[PDB]
């Protein structure tokens, strides 16, 4: 499964919905 909340995230990895792939899967609007 994609990167969950508070997970890692490269320059453009594959995170889950509701998350931002800015270094780390930031769970915020």
Elucidation method: NMR
CA distances from 22 to 1, 17, 26, 29 (A): 18, 13, 7, 13
Domain boundaries, the chain: 1-29
CB 7, CB 15: distance < 8 Å: yes
Cβ-count burial of 25 within 10 angstroms (0-12 exposed, 13-18 middle, 19+ buried)?
buried
- Of 26, 27, 17, the C-alpha closest to 2 is 17
């Amino acid at each position: 499964y994609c990167q969950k909340w508070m997970w890692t995230c490269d320059s453009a990895r594959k995170c889950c919905e509701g998350l931002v792939c800015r270094l780390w899967c930031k769970k915020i609007i």
